[PDB]
From a paper:
For both ligand complexes, electron density was observed in the conserved Ca2+ site in each of the four crystallographically independent copies of the CRD and was fitted with a mannose. In each copy, mannose binds with the 3-OH group interacting with the Ca2+ ligands Glu293 and Asn307, while the 4-OH group interacts with Glu285 and Asn287, which are part of the EPN motif. In this orientation, the axial 2-OH group forms a hydrogen bond with Lys299. Moreover, there is weak density emerging from the anomeric oxygen of this second sugar.
Langerhans cells are characterized by the presence of langerin (CD207), a C-type lectin that can act as a pathogen receptor by binding to surface glycoconjugates of microorganisms. Langerin has an extracellular region that contains (1) a C-type carbohydrate-recognition domain (CRD) that binds sugars and (2) a neck region that mediates the formation of trimers. As in other C-type lectins, the CRD of langerin contains a conserved Ca2+ binding site that binds to carbohydrates. Here we report the identification of additional glycan ligands for langerin through screening of a microarray of bacterial lipopolysaccharides and high-resolution crystal structures of the langerin CRD bound to carbohydrates representing a spectrum of ligands.
Author numbering: 198 to 325
The structure:
Amino acid sequence: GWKYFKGNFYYFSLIPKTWYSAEQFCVSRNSHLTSVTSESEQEFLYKTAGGLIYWIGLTKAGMEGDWSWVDDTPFNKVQSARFWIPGEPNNAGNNEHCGNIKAPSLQAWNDAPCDKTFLFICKRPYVP
Ligand SMILES: OC[C@H]1O[C@H](O[C@@H]2[C@H](O)[C@@H](O)O[C@H](CO)[C@H]2O)[C@@H](O)[C@@H](O)[C@@H]1O
Ligand SMILES: [Ca+2]
């Protein structure tokens, strides 16, 4: 059930999990919760999500609470600014340290508590 886009396969889960249990599922399938590195990938993801909320690979790193990608893609604060929902990340309840795709818009991301359960998206490279 993996979908193909620009050199990567993506798995849109049918069962919801916490952010970390989701990541562990992806890891068990030789993948990671997805990074987002272009407008075209953001568009593929939010369009495919079809208005449902999915965990993606966004999570905090370092003392300073900087956002990062679990697949180790360097996080580009400048180039990613256009991808959050207006007002996010807002760090609500001082307890939102993971990120999901929420709005079907280029401005799609929300920060949410890592222990909330949502559907999730794994990303696996194709290696010819
Ligand atoms: O408004 C953005 C905000 O939405 C969600 O927070 C909840 C809502 O704002 C609303 O239902 O009020 C709730 C109680 O105060 C609040 O929890 C979250 O998805 C949050 O991450 C987001 O920033
Ligand atoms: Ca939030």
